[PDB]
Amino acid sequence: ADLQDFLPGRVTADGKHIQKFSETARVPFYDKTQKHFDILDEQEI
């Protein structure tokens, strides 16, 4: 950590192409500020 050329993405349904994501964000799941863990579903993981 001292990386820029790595871009987020998701592989396609077939499994031979990657769909690039335009932008990303940080969502917390371990601080004692919100409750995103319980509201979200297990299948959504």
Side-chain angles (χ1 to χ4, degrees):
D2 190 10
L3 184 60
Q4 181 180 352
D5 296 0
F6 280 83
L7 302 172
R10 178 196 176 187
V11 298
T12 54
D14 64 331
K16 298 179 180 180
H17 310 268
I18 299 182
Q19 303 168 356
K20 176 182 175 179
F21 278 93
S22 181
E23 197 184 1
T24 60
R26 300 172 64 259
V27 47
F29 282 93
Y30 317 96
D31 54 353
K32 299 175 298 181
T33 60
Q34 294 295 335
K35 51 178 180 181
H36 292 359
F37 35 89
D38 47 66
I39 52 181
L40 293 171
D41 194 6
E42 176 180 345
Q43 303 181 8
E44 297 173 341
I45 307 180

